[PDB]
Amino acid sequence: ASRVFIVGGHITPFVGKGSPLFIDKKHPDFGKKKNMTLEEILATTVQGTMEHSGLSGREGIVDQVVVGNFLGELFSSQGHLGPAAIGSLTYGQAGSKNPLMYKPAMRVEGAAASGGLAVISAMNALKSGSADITLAVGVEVQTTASARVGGDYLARAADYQRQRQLDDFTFPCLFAKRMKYIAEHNHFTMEDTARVAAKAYANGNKNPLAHMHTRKLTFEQCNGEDPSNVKFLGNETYKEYLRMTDCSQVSDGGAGVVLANEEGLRKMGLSPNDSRLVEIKSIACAVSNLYEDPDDACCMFTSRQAAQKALSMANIKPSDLNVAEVHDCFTIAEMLMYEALGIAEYGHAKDLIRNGDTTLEGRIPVNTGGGLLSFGHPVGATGIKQIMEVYRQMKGQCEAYQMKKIPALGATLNMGGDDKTAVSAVLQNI
Amino acid sequence: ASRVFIVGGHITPFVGKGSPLFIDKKHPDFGKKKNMTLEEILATTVQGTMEHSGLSGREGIVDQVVVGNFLGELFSSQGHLGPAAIGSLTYGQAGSKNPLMYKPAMRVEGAAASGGLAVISAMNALKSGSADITLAVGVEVQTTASARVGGDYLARAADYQRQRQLDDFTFPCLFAKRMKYIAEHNHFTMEDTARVAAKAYANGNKNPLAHMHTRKLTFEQCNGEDPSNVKFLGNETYKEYLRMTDCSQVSDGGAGVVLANEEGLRKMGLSPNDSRLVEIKSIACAVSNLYEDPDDACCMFTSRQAAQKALSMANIKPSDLNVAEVHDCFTIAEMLMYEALGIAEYGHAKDLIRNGDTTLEGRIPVNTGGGLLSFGHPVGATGIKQIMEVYRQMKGQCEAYQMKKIPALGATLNMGGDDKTAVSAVLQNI
Ligand SMILES: CC(C)(COP(=O)(O)OP(=O)(O)OC[C@H]1O[C@@H](n2cnc3c(N)ncnc32)[C@H](O)[C@@H]1OP(=O)(O)O)[C@@H](O)C(=O)NCCC(=O)NCCS
Ligand SMILES: CC(C)(COP(=O)(O)OP(=O)(O)OC[C@H]1O[C@@H](n2cnc3c(N)ncnc32)[C@H](O)[C@@H]1OP(=O)(O)O)[C@@H](O)C(=O)NCCC(=O)NCCS
Numbered sequence: 031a032s033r034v035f036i037v038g039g040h041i042t043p044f045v046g047k048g049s050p051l052f053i054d055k056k057h058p059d060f061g062k063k064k065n066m067t068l069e070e071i072l073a074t075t076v077q078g079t080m081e082h083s084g085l086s087g088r089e090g091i092v093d094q095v096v097v098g099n100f101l102g103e104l105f106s107s108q109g110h111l112g113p114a115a116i117g118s119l120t121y122g123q124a125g126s127k128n129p130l131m132y133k134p135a136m137r138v139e140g141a142a143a144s145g146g147l148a149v150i151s152a153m154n155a156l157k158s159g160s161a162d163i164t165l166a167v168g169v170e171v172q173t174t175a176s177a178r179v180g181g182d183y184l185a186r187a188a189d190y191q192r193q194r195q196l197d198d199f200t201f202p203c204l205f206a207k208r209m210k211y212i213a214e215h216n217h218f219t220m221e222d223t224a225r226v227a228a229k230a231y232a233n234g235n236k237n238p239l240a241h242m243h244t245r246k247l248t249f250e251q252c253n254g255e256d257p258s259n260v261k262f263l264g265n266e267t268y269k270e271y272l273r274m275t276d277c278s279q280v281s282d283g284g285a286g287v288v289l290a291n292e293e294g295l296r297k298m299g300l301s302p303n304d305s306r307l308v309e310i311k312s313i314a315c316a317v318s319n320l321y322e323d324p325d326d327a328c329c330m331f332t333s334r335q336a337a338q339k340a341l342s343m344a345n346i347k348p349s350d351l352n353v354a355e356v357h358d359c360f361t362i363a364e365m366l367m368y369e370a371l372g373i374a375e376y377g378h379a380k381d382l383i384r385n386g387d388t389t390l391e392g393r394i395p396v397n398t399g400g401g402l403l404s405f406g407h408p409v410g411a412t413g414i415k416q417i418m419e420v421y422r423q424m425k426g427q428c429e430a431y432q433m434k435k436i437p438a439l440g441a442t443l444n445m446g447g448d449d450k451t452a453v454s455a456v457l458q459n460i
Numbered sequence: 461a462s463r464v465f466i467v468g469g470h471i472t473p474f475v476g477k478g479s480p481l482f483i484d485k486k487h488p489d490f491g492k493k494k495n496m497t498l499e500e501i502l503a504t505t506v507q508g509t510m511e512h513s514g515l516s517g518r519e520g521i522v523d524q525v526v527v528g529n530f531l532g533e534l535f536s537s538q539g540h541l542g543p544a545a546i547g548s549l550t551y552g553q554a555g556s557k558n559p560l561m562y563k564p565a566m567r568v569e570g571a572a573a574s575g576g577l578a579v580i581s582a583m584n585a586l587k588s589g590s591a592d593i594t595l596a597v598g599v600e601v602q603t604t605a606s607a608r609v610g611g612d613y614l615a616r617a618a619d620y621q622r623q624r625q626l627d628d629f630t631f632p633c634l635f636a637k638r639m640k641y642i643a644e645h646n647h648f649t650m651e652d653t654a655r656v657a658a659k660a661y662a663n664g665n666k667n668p669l670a671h672m673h674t675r676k677l678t679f680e681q682c683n684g685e686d687p688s689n690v691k692f693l694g695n696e697t698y699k700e701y702l703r704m705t706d707c708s709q710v711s712d713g714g715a716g717v718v719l720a721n722e723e724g725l726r727k728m729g730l731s732p733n734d735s736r737l738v739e740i741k742s743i744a745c746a747v748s749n750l751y752e753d754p755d756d757a758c759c760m761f762t763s764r765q766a767a768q769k770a771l772s773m774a775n776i777k778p779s780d781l782n783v784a785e786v787h788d789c790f791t792i793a794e795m796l797m798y799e800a801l802g803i804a805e806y807g808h809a810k811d812l813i814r815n816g817d818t819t820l821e822g823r824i825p826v827n828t829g830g831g832l833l834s835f836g837h838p839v840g841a842t843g844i845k846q847i848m849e850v851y852r853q854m855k856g857q858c859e860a861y862q863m864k865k866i867p868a869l870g871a872t873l874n875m876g877g878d879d880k881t882a883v884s885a886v887l888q889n890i
Contacts, residue, residue: 031589069621069751103533107624109616110571110750113880117749124752132765134745135881136577139567141540147566151581158587159461186539191499194537315564317525319547320540321499322554335562450543451565 032157032291036308036457037298038083039287039418042074044241044406046173046281068106068171071284072097072114073121075167075411079286080119084298089119090129091297092288093161097137098148098168099410104183105174111137115167134160140317141187142359143446144168145285145413146453150313152289162294167286168415170408180280184409187447189320197265202277204448205360206268211327212362213271218380220271223361224252225383227275227403230358233390234404236430241279241406251275252361276361281406285414287421303460308421311346313455314339320450328377333357333370333445336452340441341372344456348372351394352437353423355416357445358401368396371443371454390431398423398431413444413453424459462587462721466738466887467728468513469717469848472504474671474836476603476711498536498601501714502527502544503551505597505841509716510549514728519549520559521727522718523591527567528578528598529840534613535604541567545597564590570747571617572789573876574598575715575843576883580745582719592724597716598845600838607710614839617877619750627695632707634878635790636698638757642792643701647758648810650701653791654683655813657705657833660788663820664834666860671709671836681705682791706791711836715845733890738851741776743885744769750880758807760875763787763800766882767873771802774886778802781824782867783853785846787875788831798826801873801884820861828853828861843874843883854889 045051045065053065066074080089095115103109112135120126134155138147145168155161172180178198185193185200197203212218231247234240251259252275263269289310295302316335324331341347354371358364365379373394374382382388388396399405399419402412420440422428440457475482475495483495496504510519525545533539542565550556564585568577575598585591602610608628615623615630627633642648658679664670681689682705693699719740725732746766754761771777778801786801788794798809803824812818818826829835829849832842850870852858870887 067621100539101533103531103613103616107616107620109530109569110618110877110880112570113747113750113877114619116747117751121751128749131748132746132762134580135570135747136581136745137569138581139539139569140542140565150564151566151568151584154581154584154588154590157589158584160584160587182537183533186533186537188540189544190537191497315566316562317542317546317565318561319558320543321547321551332562447540447543450540 034153034156034310035290036421037288037290040075040078040082041239041285041415041418042283043239044281044283044408046241046279048245049241050244068102068108071171071282072169073118075169075284075286076115076118079167079288083288092163092165094134094155095165096148096151098144098413099137099170100139100141100144101183105171140451141446142409142412143444143451143453144410146444149417150315150453153313156289156291162297163290165288166414168411168413169284170410171282172280173282197263199263202272203263203265203268205362206263206272208327209271209362210268215328217328217377218365221253222380222383223276224249226361226364227252229389230397230401230403233398233431234400237399240400240404241281242404278359278402278407281408283408283411285411285418287414287417305460307460308424309458309460311456311458312340312343315453317451330366330370330449332449333443333452336454337371337443340454340456351439351441353420353440354396355419356396356443358397358403367443395433416442416444420457464583464586464740465720466851467718467720470505470508470512471669471715471845471848472501472713473669474711474713474838476671476709478675479671480674498532498538499544501601501712502599503548505599505714505716506545506548509718513718522593522595524563524585525565525595526578526581528574528843529567529600530569530571530574531613535601570881571876572839572842573874573881573883574840576874580743580883583743586719586721592727593720595718596844597714598841598843599714600840601712602710602838603712610710627693629693632702633693633695633698635792636693636702639701639792640698641757645758647807648795651683652810652813653706654679656791656794657682659819660831660833663828663861664830667829670830670834671711672834708789708832708837711838713838713841715841715848717844717847737890738854739888739890741886741888742770742773745883747881760796760800760879762879763873763875763882766884767801770884770886781869781871783850783870784826785849786826786873788827788833797873825863846872846874850887
């Protein structure tokens with residue numbers, strides 16, 4: 031049975047309202063220069079990932095490419111990103127020799143789990159004998175529409191017919207609804223979720239790539255003592271359970287990873303114990319029913335299933351993990367993810383957050399670079415970013431947020447929609 | 461090399477304007493009952509495919525599900541079809557036990573090649589040890605908007621920034637443009653393409669599933685001697701090279717296949733020589749550059765690469781083929797596909813069409829049930845429908861268009877966008 035290695039990757043800056051890199055009315059270059067397009071982001075990410083993986087000048091030995099994207103077709107009027115990817119190496123240089131021509135490529139989609147799904151596709155290709163080296167890249171541009179139109183586009187991840195009517199901000203409302211049930215059962219509090227945000231923003235502050243790098247927020251501000259942290263939903267039933275700072279960012283960006291099997295390492299002139307590597311011990315996907323929600327909003331069943339398949343295939347337990355990256359699309363999700371991954375027991379996510387166990391100096395750091403809340407959330411990119419963040423901590427590459435104890439085992443947990451798709455991976459430092 | 465087998469599948473009726481199954485002003489149930497939604501089609505297809513494959517009552521032994529869909533997010537406001545698929549077995553029966561819960565599922569996309577890509581993904585899962593039995597379904601609902609608004613959505617398959625401006629009907633125009641170059645080089649004529657249409661429609665007439673089943677068209681009518689067969693593009697440069705009858709249909713529908721490896725056949729209680737099977741000897745994907753077109757419109761380079769990889773991996777030649785399905789999204793495409801597949805030499809597709817070699821009684825029948833022109837073209841479903849049509853002819857299941865000499869070998873050629881993605885498979889009767 032065939033091994034699988036992360037050889038290298040790349041995460042772009044994540045940009046949107048609030049970032050100094052984002053060009054808006056207030057920006058020095060407003061009207062003069064533009065933010066990157068989807069094509070441009072995809073080009074930077076494909077090229078960044080080749081460069082950092084040592085493939086510049088021999089990109090022809092990549093056997094195939096998988097692109098994770100959720101809503102390109104709506105935000106940029108652009109689907110069919112497979113051939114977009116094939117043309118990304120030499121983007122804007124007409125006629126140039128393209129070593130990726132004619133190779134297999136596709137886009138895969140499962141809402142915010144698209145990146146994660148791109149990695150599983152790539153890993154199947156590696157273990158099937160159809161590929162020895164594969165490129166998995168995920169990208170998204172969301173800043174081309176308003177929060178309201180964007181919210182309707184993101185509603186595509188829900189059972190639209192059934193759930194769109196909840197609120198224009200369908201997804202924030204779906205997690206408000208969970209928080210209502212969570213409050214009524216005393217599973218954890220809105221104080222606890224403010225503590226998650228405080229952690230994310232503190233981590234972001236140490237991360238120049240993070241969308242919210244330049245924004246500082248105290249616990250008290252996250253807890254709603256700022257009037258600018260408004261409860262913005264229209265739905266009266268759930269309005270009171272969600273503040274702006276509980277929400278992940280509308281961001282643009284990309285992340286890419288190059289994966290290889292043993293034959294691929296050989297082709298690259300590398301040995302299986304080269305210290306630039308990380309092994310993906312296991313990866314697993316679990317998907318539930320779009321059309322039916324379970325009663326217990328305090329449990330992410332689908333994510334827990336994926337985390338358990340992966341930890342089991344890796345033959346380790348949650349306590350053996352040294353770092354993790356999880357799908358904090360809201361502060362509410364991060365709490366739920368601690369329990370889905372298994373690093374806290376059902377009902378004990380609050381213990382972990384109250385004791386700082388998941389902070390950089392805690393015993394099981396999570397979302398070290400700021401997570402979706404601060405790093406940001408260009409949806410298609412997230413699942414691959416998660417993989418690369420564990421990589422980077424493992425390889426000592428995280429600078430201001432580098433962990434002082436290099437982690438030997440790490441896990442990711444990537445989520446599509448309202449816990450309807452989940453992908454989880456176990457990573458082993460080499 | 462682990463072997464892969466088609467165990468069974470299902471093709472819905474394909475429906476749209478002109479079909480007696482399609483509910484419009486002319487339909488008895490107009491105003492009273494509605495056409496199937498995307499969710500509904502997906503349900504019918506998943507259930508159909510399980511039933512025909514002998515999995516009713518043991519759907520739990522399916523390991524994974526991949527969905528091919530191109531534009532659900534635009535036409536139906538619905539992405540994230542993976543979990544929609546997981547909930548399709550028991551669609552509309554709230555609370556019911558679901559044996560597909562927690563299994564891996566995703567959606568894959570490469571324009572009109574989406575179905576083909578779903579098959580490749582499933583096949584990788586089969587050969588990777590991640591699956592022994594996989595379900596690949598493709599679906600699409602395109603009748604929820606006009607042909608014009610639909611044309612802009614389908615533009616997502618082109619380099620939208622660059623090519624949308626050609627015409628509201630971006631794709632028809634892209635193939636009109638090829639036809640202009642084709643005419644100038646005398647590669648083949650508009651007469652020849654009318655002969656393709658005549659063939660499609662005559663085949664469709666023998667196929668109750670076909671969108672255009674009830675419509676009859678003479679060569680002369682396809683050749684533009686009907687004034688109702690209009691040259692409908694706005695673009696003055698290409699207007700004259702495309703008639704309505706050259707175009708594939710705006711259709712709704714689904715197609716599904718169940719694929720198994722040797723371990724999967726065992727699990728199902730079947731032997732590798734069971735005569736309900738067909739082997740997929742090979743499959744290949746080839747993707748070119750979205751952003752650059754080759755000068756020679758008389759050659760589908762990307763499709764030809766895929767066809768040659770597949771025939772080669774199967775260790776056969778084009779002359780060994782007994783039947784084929786090819787991606788006739790326009791009559792112009794079918795001609796080009798004969799040469800891409802290799803059943804005609806460069807410049808000789810006209811020979812084949814002129815002496816009826818690709819008709820039901822010809823020596824290499826192509827698109828026996830009517831192809832995209834008449835059977836119809838719900839884009840995501842097409843790639844899998846192609847596979848199933850070769851299956852059905854092989855298993856004697858085609859009724860009024862059944863071939864009198866059962867074919868031993870068949871090939872498919874499925875295309876995304878303007879020859880930017882191609883998938884081709886070689887099938888061996890058992
Ligand atoms: C970014 C986000 C917090 C919106 O906030 P924003 O950047 O300030 O943008 P806006 O201020 O335009 O939108 C907030 C809305 O709340 C309401 N609001 C009321 N008072 C407000 C105030 N003082 N400040 C901000 N918004 C206010 C408004 O209706 C406003 O929208 P409008 O412009 O249509 O009136 C939110 O839309 C978001 O991030 N959503 C992401 C959800 C997601 O990605 N889910 C997928 C997970 S897989
Ligand atoms: C051919 C096709 C466009 C026509 O379907 P339709 O609904 O019967 O045709 P419509 O009635 O909408 O007419 C379309 C256009 O024909 C044009 N036209 C010009 N003169 C006309 C006339 N006398 N009568 C009818 N139409 C005429 C019009 O411009 C009209 O659009 P409009 O009403 O917005 O102006 C449709 O089958 C199609 O779009 N096929 C292509 C699918 C595809 O592109 N697939 C590729 C993906 S791999």
